[PDB]
Design a protein around this ligand. Structure first.
Ligand SMILES: [Cl-]
Ligand SMILES: [Cl-]
Ligand SMILES: [Cl-]
Ligand SMILES: [Cl-]
Ligand SMILES: [Cl-]
Ligand SMILES: [Cl-]
Lengths: 132, 133
């Protein structure tokens, strides 16, 4: 099956909304959700970083299942930056779509993407679903 | 009674077709109609042929939606707004499930770009935005 890939940074109200939408897509299409979080994996990647990531993924998959979809955790430590990691993973598993959270920001004489969201949306070779 | 799928289309194009096909599939799965939108400002700068082309694009787009087995409606927006604000406000007004929009992906010089309308729709929207290449 071609999964829904959902990228989560941390546990947050936004992440929950992202996961709920991803679960709905998966339920409708009859495919599992692969929940991903990316770390580089060098000397800079600390114990607590990995702890938090594992907790986030465990929580995320529980949300997917509660919303009536099948979910799997995929921690990625592949020596890549997160956007490239997410995009490459999505291609590797032949994802139907990537689901990501975006910060809802009002304009301040300028209106900008976070570097991670920007690069996921633009570099992906799959549909990208952006949730606030 | 229903929360529609909103699809923003610029012109008749291969990209627009892919956008519409994805939107139709979302609509078929959810059992909701597709509202196809195109935005113009509507002052003296907006010429008659601009409006004609936009109406033709919407008519074409709805035919694609129906061919893909979904219910579609045309919604031309001439409301004195910039396209991104217009699309985002429309989606809120109709309580859309999601906005589906096309992304330009590459510039003539191979730069990774959204396209100015899609970029601002993605950032400004309150609704989920589905980005199709
Ligand atoms: Cl998030
Ligand atoms: Cl279901
Ligand atoms: Cl388009
Ligand atoms: Cl129809
Ligand atoms: Cl851009
Ligand atoms: Cl553009």
């Amino acid at each position: 099956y071609m999964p829904i890939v959902v990228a989560v940074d941390k546990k947050s109200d936004r992440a929950e909304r992202v996961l709920r939408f991803a679960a709905e897509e998966a339920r409708l299409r009859g495919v599992p959700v692969y929940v991903v979080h990316s770390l580089p994996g060098g000397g800079r990647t600390k114990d607590e970083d990995i702890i938090e990531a594992k907790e986030t993924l465990s929580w995320a998959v529980s949300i997917i299942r509660k919303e009536g979809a099948e979910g799997e955790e995929h921690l990625l430590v592949r020596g890549k930056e997160p956007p490239d990691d997410i995009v490459d993973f999505a291609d590797e598993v032949d994802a139907i779509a990537i689901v990501i959270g975006i910060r809802k920001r009002s304009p301040t004489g300028k209106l900008i993407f976070g570097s991670v969201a920007r690069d996921v949306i633009l570099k992906a070779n799959k549909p990208v679903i952006c949730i606030k």
